[PDB]
Amino acid sequence: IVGGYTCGANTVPYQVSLNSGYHFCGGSLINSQWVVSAAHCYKSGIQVRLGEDNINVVEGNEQFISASKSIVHPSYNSNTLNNDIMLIKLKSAASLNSRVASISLPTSCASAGTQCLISGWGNTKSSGTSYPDVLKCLKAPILSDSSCKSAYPGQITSNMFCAGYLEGGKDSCQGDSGGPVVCSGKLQGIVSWGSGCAQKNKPGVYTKVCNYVSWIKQTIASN
Amino acid sequence: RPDFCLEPPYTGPCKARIIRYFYNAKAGLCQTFVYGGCRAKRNNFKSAEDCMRTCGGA
Ligand SMILES: [Ca+2]
């Protein structure tokens, strides 16, 4: 997250870290045994880390649980990035408390202008490299489909949305993929891609979760 | 020895932080870099051994 602020310990209880010997992607807890992330975060040997704040130091509220299944959307296209969503089943159910909780799926899509909260342990610099120890947060608005398409001609599908600021300086970045975009207490997006990070006229692109609600519910129930 | 072994590492537009290897012709060895998770170019390997086997000596 570039241009954000320190969230505060366990203030985003649905945020998880996907670890393969190091943090490589984020995710969101949707129930005691399931996490939603980006399809491009698929890797073998994933360990899901819940209740994290400082990802480099054991603080006492963590739960480390291995993934038992990773289900990538059957229509994920690795070239166009369309349908960039994946579901991860935990080998054992997590213990839900105040520091570890699920986030609700949306009942309807969010419109341009809605303010959302984006979080992650990704790079905090637009030029250069600086990975934080603690979770970073950013408040950013959802942008109109028109503006999103003008920023990325011929690359935006109906399953994506842009969020951020056209002046740049505030955005999600490498290490934030798979993480949540929460608006009015509902999970509306997943950190996906963009042209660099925090660049002028190039806001971040996110997977539009509202289009996958039925798929998510049925898939979780049949696995 | 291939030409792709001489190309600079490509992170790509996706926002993961996946550690991969690339052949660095200037230093004559395989080095690590951050890959974003999509649209990989060919000078991108999952291990130093794969990188050295494919690009070693370029
Ligand atoms: Ca920790």
Side-chain angles (χ1 to χ4, degrees):
Chain A
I1 303 291
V2 181
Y5 58 96
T6 296
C7 304
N10 311 115
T11 60
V12 185
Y14 49 81
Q15 174 82 53
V16 309
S17 164
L18 300 188
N19 184 288
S20 182
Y22 56 95
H23 165 84
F24 74 93
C25 274
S28 300
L29 192 67
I30 52 176
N31 74 31
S32 65
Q33 196 161 25
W34 292 84
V35 168
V36 59
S37 189
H40 71 266
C41 291
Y42 172 83
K43 273 185 82 67
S44 50
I46 295 171
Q47 181 186 65
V48 180
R49 300 190 171 192
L50 308 88
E52 290 281 16
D53 187 43
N54 184 320
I55 52 162
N56 293 312
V57 175
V58 176
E59 290 183 296
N61 298 292
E62 303 88 341
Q63 287 178 55
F64 293 177
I65 305 166
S66 305
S68 61
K69 295 176 177 176
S70 292
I71 307 169
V72 175
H73 194 280
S75 298
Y76 173 57
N77 187 307
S78 65
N79 288 304
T80 65
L81 311 179
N82 193 32
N83 302 301
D84 191 16
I85 183 173
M86 165 179 77
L87 296 170
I88 299 167
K89 187 183 186 184
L90 299 175
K91 129 279 187 185
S92 63
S95 292
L96 304 176
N97 54 80
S98 60
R99 300 185 175 71
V100 178
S102 60
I103 185 66
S104 305
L105 292 175
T107 54
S108 66
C109 301
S111 55
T114 306
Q115 273 244 300
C116 307
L117 179 68
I118 307 174
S119 50
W121 288 277
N123 191 2
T124 63
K125 288 188 178 297
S126 56
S127 59
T129 294
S130 186
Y131 288 102
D133 295 318
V134 299
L135 189 66
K136 298 292 173 169
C137 280
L138 173 70
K139 301 195 181 188
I142 288 173
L143 308 178
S144 66
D145 186 58
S146 294
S147 64
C148 192
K149 289 178 175 173
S150 299
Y152 298 99
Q155 304 162 63
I156 307 302
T157 69
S158 61
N159 300 305
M160 298 170 192
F161 71 85
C162 284
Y165 305 79
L166 294 179
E167 72 197 306
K170 293 177 177 182
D171 202 355
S172 50
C173 201
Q174 279 63 46
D176 290 321
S177 280
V181 177
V182 176
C183 324
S184 294
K186 308 294 185 183
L187 181 71
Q188 292 288 356
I190 296 164
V191 180
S192 190
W193 65 279
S195 281
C197 311
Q199 300 302 294
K200 303 189 183 184
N201 302 314
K202 298 291 186 179
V205 185
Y206 301 87
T207 305
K208 193 170 187 179
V209 177
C210 64
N211 290 353
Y212 300 97
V213 179
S214 68
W215 176 77
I216 293 166
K217 291 184 179 297
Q218 187 63 28
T219 301
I220 289 170
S222 50
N223 282 281
Chain B
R1 210 162 186 173
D3 300 298
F4 71 81
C5 295
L6 306 176
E7 294 298 308
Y10 183 70
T11 294
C14 292
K15 296 177 176 173
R17 195 278 295 272
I18 298 167
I19 298 167
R20 292 290 180 80
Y21 291 78
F22 75 101
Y23 182 78
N24 184 347
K26 195 182 182 183
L29 81 180
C30 291
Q31 295 212 279
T32 55
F33 80 105
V34 174
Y35 172 51
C38 69
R39 296 181 179 160
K41 291 189 178 306
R42 288 176 295 173
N43 195 10
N44 178 326
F45 306 87
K46 296 173 179 178
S47 71
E49 294 68 39
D50 288 338
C51 178
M52 291 302 275
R53 196 181 309 109
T54 304
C55 292

